[PDB]
């Protein structure tokens, strides 16, 4: 008589109630045990009284006992082997539901006797009658193959998986190809066994006559496939093309992944390329009218789709304007997709909503909008003066979280156009109407350093920052030298106490080796040959690209194949979350 | 010094909150949730002292109620833990027995006991008999 618990201020024994003949009281007792297990108790001292006492009715009590076993399979095998023989003697039961439940609760046990005592009930239910038994069998095959270890009959398990790929039931063959993709997570010798001219047709017939869940795994394993034929490829695209399934988002984005990775043709001469461009846009537009979470996932994938191929949602931008009853993530991503799709024919529709979004209440959304105005200024050619005037009017309101983000996109406009805006500096640097965050500080310091012919009192504005030399800004030297490598030559015996003070601060005061190496590279250059320093530092620079907030092309080609994956939502490399 | 005294049940409500330092309204809304998320997860087989950034929050669990007294890391944690238990015993002996329903229904007596026990981050009276005599004299 051990592990005595209470009931609302009473005293009663659980083990006598478990061993009693009252099956309803035993069910209530094991329900209380499972409730304690869910809330987080240590009920592991009842295992030989809940396992070996399996003498009552089959279905509900056996399901609860198997739930207890699949929850506490990480326990000791000395306690787990009390009735494990009668546990694994369940592949000859008359109920295939009981057999499938026994297989599904035996697969989660990572014990040393698993590969020597579970291969016979697994192989005794592979070529079974009920398809759910084969479904659970392939699930447990993938579960045992998750360790990727050489089992007792692992080659026979892989051969049975290859046989189950070409079988009758569509959910069974979908789960089998999903298990092949799961064992294909590593790089074995038999990685991605295609067996094209029969398995492709079998997978297409399974996709045509499948349910609303196996299509995701089928298209997931189809996404990594890369053929080389033409008529076979067109038949694959024709079978893939009808996709408006009831699972409104996952199947659609997996089919978009298949169609975008399945793009190996002429990018301007293939008529079927234009057919696919016409095909992708009704799902990529009607995908947004659902629940907010799959809407956010769809927007994060549509951002990568637009960054790679801009000619998909180019003619449809009215579905990307933000309404007033959306959450913050949809509100940000619709804005970013809108300012990426701001073309040369919708600027009047874009700019009114852009100047309207600046008066909102979400602080990060207002920051994204005041960066978005400058990004639209970089994008549109004949709107930069109006957007510069709009940014100056927003700065003149003297808002702390608006000026510190507006001066960065103003610096981006100055970098894109180096001659047409030589009048904003003497006002904007003279304002400094905040205590700027380091991005705005770097923007201010670079704007002061460049264009030095019109900011000739820059020594005071640089020495205001030069005293407090504690931030992450190497611009205070790499922009000081690029201007006072010519102003110090035009005015000798002048600003030596700047072009040597910042080098003495970057030589033996800054502990950062990057800043120290920049200081030594500058100090060994301008102190030897001023014409060479003017040729190296003050050379002409090329203009930046039009699309500002881009990712690297290698990471974009990485995220092309992972459109349905979580790396598309995180916008990170897939080795950033292991 | 005592920064705050909290009575939090396991459901999530706050029954008694005394704040001796200068906290804002958002700070008072955030520190209650942080105290709940730190305290109401650890079981009885752990310690009774938790650290937040520089805190030494001392908690006990009396029948679903969670008594928390915060301090900085300079003072005797067992002394403040037994101060918590002495305050719970004072609230017990004010009645014949006490619970969460009694602490809700007699909060005007609870604040009287707290103001006659703790003040300005320190302890006012270590004893219990004089506090019971003061409560019986103020009962009229």
């Amino acid at each position: 008589k051990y592990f005595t618990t209470n009931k609302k201020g009473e005293i009663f024994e659980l083990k006598a109630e478990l061993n009693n003949e009252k099956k309803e009281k035993r069910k209530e007792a094991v329900k209380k045990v499972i409730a304690a297990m869910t809330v987080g108790k240590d009920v592991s001292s009842l295992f030989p009284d809940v396992v070996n006492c399996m003498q009552t009715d089959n279905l509900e009590l056996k399901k609860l006992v198997y739930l207890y076993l699949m929850n506490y399979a990480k326990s000791q095998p000395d306690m787990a082997i009390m009735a494990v023989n009668s546990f694994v003697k369940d592949c000859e039961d008359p109920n295939p539901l009981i057999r499938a439940l026994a297989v599904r609760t035996m697969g989660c046990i990572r014990v040393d006797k698993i590969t020597e005592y579970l291969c016979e009930p697994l192989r005794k239910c592979l070529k079974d009658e009920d398809p759910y038994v084969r479904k659970t069998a392939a699930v447990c095959v993938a579960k045992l193959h998750d360790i990727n270890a050489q089992m007792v009959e692992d080659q026979g398990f892989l051969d049975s998986l290859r046989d189950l790929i070409a079988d009758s039931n569509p959910m069974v063959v979908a789960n089998a190809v999903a298990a092949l993709s799961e064992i294909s997570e590593s790089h074995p010798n038999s990685n991605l066994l295609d067996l094209n001219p029969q398995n492709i047709n079998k997978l297409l017939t399974a996709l045509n006559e499948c349910t609303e869940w196996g299509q995701i795994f089928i298209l997931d394993c189809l996404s990594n496939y890369n053929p080389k034929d033409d008529r076979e490829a067109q038949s694959i695209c024709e079978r893939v093309t009808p996709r408006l399934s009831h699972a409104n988002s996952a199947v659609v984005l997996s089919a978009v992944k298949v169609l975008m990775k399945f793009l190996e043709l002429l990018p301007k001469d293939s008529d079927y390329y234009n057919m696919l461009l016409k095909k992708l846009a009704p799902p990529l537009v009607t995908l947004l009218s659902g629940e907010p979470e799959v809407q956010y996932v769809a927007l994060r994938n549509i951002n990568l789709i637009v960054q790679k191929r801009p000619e998909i949602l180019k003619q449809e931008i009215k579905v990307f304007f933000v309404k007033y009853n959306d959450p913050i993530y949809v509100k940000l991503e619709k804005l970013d997709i809108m300012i990426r799709l701001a073309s040369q024919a919708n600027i009047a529709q874009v700019l009114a909503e852009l100047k309207e979004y600046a008066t909102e209440v979400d602080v990060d959304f207002v920051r994204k909008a005041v960066r978005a105005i400058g990004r639209c200024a970089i994008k549109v050619e004949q709107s930069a003066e109006r957007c510069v005037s709009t940014l100056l009017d927003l700065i003149q309101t003297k808002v702390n979280y608006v000026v510190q983000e507006a001066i960065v996109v103003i610096r981006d406009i100055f970098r894109k156009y180096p001659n047409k805006y030589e009048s904003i500096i003497a006002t904007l640097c003279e304002n400094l109407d905040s205590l700027d965050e380091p991005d705005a500080r770097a923007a201010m310091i670079w704007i002061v350093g460049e264009y030095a012919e019109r900011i000739d009192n820059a020594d005071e504005l640089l020495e205001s920052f030069l005293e407090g030399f504690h931030d992450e800004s190497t611009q205070v030297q790499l922009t000081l030298l690029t201007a006072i490598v010519k102003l110090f030559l035009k005015k000798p015996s002048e600003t030596q106490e700047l072009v040597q003070q910042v080098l003495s601060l970057a030589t033996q005061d800054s502990d950062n080796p990057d800043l120290r190496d920049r200081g030594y590279i500058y100090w060994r250059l301008l102190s030897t040959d001023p014409v060479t320093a003017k040729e190296v530092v003050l050379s002409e620079k090329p203009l930046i690209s039009e699309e500002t907030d881009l990712i690297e092309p290698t990471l974009l080609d990485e995220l092309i194949c992972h459109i349905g994956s979580l790396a598309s939502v995180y916008h990170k490399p897939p080795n950033a979350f292991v | 010094m005592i920064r705050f005294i909290l009575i939090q049940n396991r459901a999530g409500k706050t029954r008694l909150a005394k704040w001796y330092m200068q906290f804002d309204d958002d700070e008072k809304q955030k520190l209650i949730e942080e105290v709940h998320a730190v305290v109401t997860v650890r079981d009885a087989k752990h310690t009774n002292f938790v650290e937040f950034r520089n805190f030494k929050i001392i908690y006990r669990r009396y029948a679903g109620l969670y008594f928390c007294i915060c301090v900085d890391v300079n003072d005797n944690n067992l002394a403040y833990l037994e101060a918590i238990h002495n305050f719970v015993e004072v609230l017990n002996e004010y009645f014949h027995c006490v619970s969460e329903l009694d602490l809700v229904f007699n909060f005007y007596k609870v604040y009287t006991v707290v103001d006659e026990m703790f003040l300005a981050g320190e302890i006012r009276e270590t004893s219990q008999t004089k506090v019971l005599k003061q409560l019986l004299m103020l009962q009229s």
Partner: peptide, 10 residues
């Protein structure tokens, strides 16, 4: 023939 403990305050 035992009785029940006083668990609740009346």
């Amino acid at each position: 023939m035992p009785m029940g403990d006083i668990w609740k305050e009346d």
